[PDB]
Amino acid sequence: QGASVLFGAPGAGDIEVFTTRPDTLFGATYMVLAPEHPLVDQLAADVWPQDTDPRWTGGQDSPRAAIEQYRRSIAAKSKEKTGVFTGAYATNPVSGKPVPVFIADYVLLGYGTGAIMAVPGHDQRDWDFANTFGLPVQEVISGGDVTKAAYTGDGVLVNSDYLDGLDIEAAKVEVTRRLVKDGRGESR
Ligand SMILES: NC[C@H]1O[B@@-]2(O[C@@H]3[C@H](O2)[C@@H](COP(=O)(O)O)O[C@H]3n2cnc3c(N)ncnc32)c2c(OCCCO)cccc21
């Protein structure tokens, strides 16, 4: 079933996410917090990082500016995917890779922890946001074509280290076991 997963981020402690597909953790290429999530102000960087995409900034000169205008954007005129980058990168808890942290109103503050891991290869909501904003799309479930659409079907784990070859249900169990031993999550 589901899991609580911890993504460490510099200066912000852990960002906890709820996922029903922990098996897809090696395909989590970014993270999304609800715009009013309390850690966002802590996460905002002082300077857009080098590899910030201009589509990520709301056209603003700094992370805090983009965040403020995006929040303001949610009040005015309060569909398509919108959001901004915070400047922050969290540590993926199974691969160690950097995952950029966004805010976007498709993530509800009041559901779960108010934060998700985003797996565009296998969640069409995340696929849509990644295709609008230009985020990497990683296949970890064999069976479709993640360059055309999220693959939500059954298949075997790939590009996922000790999960490779596992069926999805077995992969959920194994990744959760590893998260528990590593202090990085639990079943929920
Ligand atoms: N996103 C990557 C991975 O994780 B998913 O997305 C999170 C989390 O799992 C899921 C939790 O929904 P349920 O409690 O009903 O089970 O919704 C999403 N979610 C959790 N909290 C959220 C929030 N606050 N706001 C918006 N979405 C949220 C997920 C999928 O969800 C399919 C089920 C959607 O109803 C399918 C494939 C891959 C995944």
Residue numbers in the entry: 304 to 381, 389 to 498
Paper lines:
Leucyl-tRNA synthetases (LeuRSs) are examples of aaRSs that rely on their editing domains to limit misaminoacylation of tRNA with near-cognate amino acids and maintain the fidelity of the genetic code. Here, we identified epetraborole (EPT) from the MMV pandemic response box as an inhibitor against the essential protein leucyl-tRNA synthetase (LeuRS) in M. abscessus. Benzoxaboroles were shown to inhibit LeuRS in fungi, gram-negative pathogens and most recently M. tuberculosis. To gain insight into the interactions between EPT and LeuRS, we solved the crystal structure of the M. abscessus editing domain (LeuRS303-498).
AMP acts as a surrogate for the 3’ end of the tRNA acceptor stem. In concordance with the binding mode of action of benzoxaboroles, we detected strong electron density in the active site corresponding to the EPT-AMP adduct formed through covalent interactions between the boron atom of EPT and the 2’ and 3’ hydroxyl groups on the ribose ring of AMP. In addition, R435 (R449 in M. tuberculosis) hydrogen bonds with the ethoxy oxygen of EPT and packed with the ribose of AMP. EPT has a hydroxypropyl ether moiety, rather than the ethyl ether in the benzoxaborole bound to M. tuberculosis LeuRS, but the extension shows very weak electron density and likely does not contribute to binding. The only notable difference is a ~1 Å shift in phosphate group of the EPT-AMP adduct. In both complexes, the phosphate is pinned between Y421 (Y435) and T323 (T337). The electron density indicates that there are multiple rotomeric conformations of T323, meaning its hydroxyl could hydrogen bond with the phosphate or with the 3’ O and ether oxygen of the adduct. Comparing unliganded and liganded residues in M. abscessus editing domain structures shows a sizable shift of residues 416–422, located around the adenosine pocket, upon drug binding, including ordering of Y421 to interact with the EPT-AMP adduct phosphate, and a decrease of B factors in the neighbouring residues. From the structural data, we propose that EPT binds LeuRS from M. abscessus and M. tuberculosis in a similar manner with similar affinity, providing a shared pathway for future structure-activity relationship analysis.
